[PDB]
Ligand binder design. Structure first.
Ligand code: 198
Length: 581
């Protein structure tokens, strides 16, 4: 092992990525902390790290990264008045302190909306002080996204920098800049959500849950690779994410760089698709390897029957190494089905596992588990149908109206759920329609189903913060694999007593005329969830009336050029109609 860990990571990562990764670590633990305080702390930690590189036996150079980083964070976090119960983490020592910070990560920090300033003013600040502009980005995203995959946030940290470098020198700065920023915002929300699911799996369901997931996905991605190679990649990938999820970001970034390096040096044994990625710089290389197209599978792969049902050693091999054998099953089933969602492949492996458990205790196990693959049929057909059915509804409704349909459905199922959580989750589910229905069938399932997992997990973690519905808690705690059907099965809450009516939540203001079309949609969708919470028995027919009427007076008052009287009177008609009943 290494004398001085901060020295080892400092020299392995280089100064620039060290400081950026420590700034993220700090920002993801103490989300409410001001930017300038975090930068000062990172500066001190970094100065110290440099004394350790020069001399590894200097005073505190042999402490853990968390002891070093923890103490520095607590110089500003022991402040209970301006923060809160983050002060109690500083009453603990490692490793209990880090565990405390991990458990206090807030998925919905009460933090200001991030308003985007004039392209002209953004561009001025960028040339003025480049480094600080980019630290500000790192900081703002990390405190709002406490599980953002740190190494990818650095890649995320290299691209807006490229965007600003290029677009601030363009003739039309805004035409260059905005679509690049819009695309980075969306893909960043997708990245965050994707990583929250990896962490939720690791932290709540264990390393074994995560590995089976990795075996399934990497076997689809690298179908030419040998099981022993996939297994090695799974081990290295699992160690990387366990570290980031456990707040060991320096180690996480280092072990990821090592893995991308390993992958590119063993390319002929992994995938035929890695060529271009492996010529890119470190950050875009790692990103490219992570998003790479599936390799084409080998041509005439055998049936899998002779290794997993017909063989006389099926029950013996399972007994002697349950986990690598099932891993082998998942490797072989998943390589052959890039058209199956990861979550479907994990269900198939569980059904095979539960079948061996029952049948390897029978008279002749072979006669018991003989028709095992036959039982996969309804498991396979079921996602296919939901997706066919749901994509058809999408085509006749369009994204926006599709979202509204889910808002109404999901509000009736679980009306106790926070309104901003219902809006976000339904809108994002509605984004499955756009992103996945555009595909031919055999590509649809992984796209639609694996993305639902990401979105339902957001629902689970947002609801976990302040739980309000036992049934959501149940679906969220029961399994990972069984989450989508546990949610689909939920029926309309009859027990739910309607909400009283509040004028304010259905009264709008002129400031809505200044918002983008999208924000204005989000506003109407918010009002729509509140409508259903007020009258949950209302018919789809009734709903569309108040919706179209909402649209007309938004239309009418934004073109009324008066004294907010438009948004007042039309907000008084709703207050009068309610006081009357
Ligand atoms: C004017 C400025 O505040 C310059 S800056 O203070 O150095 C800064 C840079 C990046 C930030 F995310 C926040 C603040 C700025 O660029 N702010 C800003 C605010 C919100 C968003 C968003 N979304 C952005 C963007 F660069 F990310 F678009 C930038």
């Amino acid at each position: 092992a290494h004398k001085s860990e901060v020295a080892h990571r400092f020299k392995d990562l280089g100064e620039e990525n060290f400081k950026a990764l420590v700034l993220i670590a700090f920002a993801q633990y103490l989300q409410q902390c001001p930017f300038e305080d975090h930068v000062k702390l990172v500066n001190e930690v970094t100065e110290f790290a440099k004394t350790c590189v020069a001399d590894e036996s200097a005073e505190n150079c042999d402490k853990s990264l968390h002891t070093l980083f923890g103490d520095k964070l607590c110089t500003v976090a022991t402040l209970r008045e301006t923060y809160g119960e983050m002060a109690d983490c500083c009453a603990k020592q490692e490793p209990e302190r880090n565990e405390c910070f991990l458990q206090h990560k807030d998925d919905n920090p009460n933090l200001p909306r991030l308003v985007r300033p004039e392209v002209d003013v953004m561009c001025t600040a960028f040339h003025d002080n480049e480094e600080t502009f980019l630290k500000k980005y790192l900081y703002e995203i990390a405190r709002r996204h406490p599980y953002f995959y740190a190494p990818e946030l650095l890649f995320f940290a290299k691209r807006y920098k490229a965007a600003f470098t290029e677009c601030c020198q363009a003739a039309d700065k805004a035409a260059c800049l905005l679509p690049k920023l819009d695309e980075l915002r969306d893909e960043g929300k997708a990245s965050s959500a994707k990583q929250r699911l990896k962490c939720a799996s690791l932290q709540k369901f264990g390393e074994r849950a995560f590995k089976a997931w990795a075996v399934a996905r990497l076997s689809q991605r690298f179908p030419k690779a040998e099981f022993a190679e996939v297994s090695k990649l799974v081990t290295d990938l699992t160690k990387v994410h366990t570290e980031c999820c456990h707040g060991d970001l320096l180690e996480c970034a280092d072990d990821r760089a090592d893995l991308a390096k390993y992958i590119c040096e063993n390319q002929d044994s992994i995938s035929s698709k890695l060529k271009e990625c492996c010529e890119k710089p470190l950050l875009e290389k790692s990103h490219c390897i992570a998003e790479v197209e599936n390799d084409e599978m080998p041509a005439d792969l055998p049936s899998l029957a002779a290794d997993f049902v017909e063989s006389k050693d099926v029950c013996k091999n399972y007994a002697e190494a349950k986990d690598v054998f099932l891993g082998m099953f998942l490797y072989e089933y998943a390589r052959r089905h890039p058209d199956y969602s990861v979550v479907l492949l994990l269900r198939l492996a569980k059904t095979y596992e539960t079948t061996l458990e029952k049948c390897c205790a029978a008279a002749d196990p072979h006669e018991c588990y003989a028709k095992v693959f036959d039982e996969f049929k309804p498991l396979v057909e079921e996602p296919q149908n939901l997706i066919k059915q749901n994509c058809e509804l999408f085509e006749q409704l369009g994204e926006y109206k599709f979202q509204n349909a889910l808002l109404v459905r999901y509000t009736k199922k679980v009306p106790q759920v926070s309104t901003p959580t219902l809006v976000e989750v339904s809108r994002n589910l509605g984004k499955v329609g756009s992103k996945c229905c555009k595909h031919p069938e055999a590509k649809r399932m992984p796209c639609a189903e694996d993305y639902l997992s990401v979105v339902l997990n957001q629902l689970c973690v947002l609801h976990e913060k302040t739980p309000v519905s036992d049934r959501v808690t149940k679906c969220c705690t029961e399994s990972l694999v069984n989450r989508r059907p546990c949610f689909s099965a939920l029926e309309v809450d009859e027990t739910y007593v309607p909400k009283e009516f509040n004028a304010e939540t259905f009264t709008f203001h002129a400031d809505i005329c200044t918002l983008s079309e999208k924000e204005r949609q989000i506003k109407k969708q918010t009002a729509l969830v509140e409508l259903v919470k007020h009258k949950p028995k209302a018919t789809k027919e009734q709903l569309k009336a108040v919706m179209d009427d909402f649209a007309a007076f938004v239309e009418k008052c934004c073109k009324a050029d008066d004294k907010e009287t438009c948004f007042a009177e039309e907000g008084k008609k709703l207050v009068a109609a309610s006081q009357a009943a």
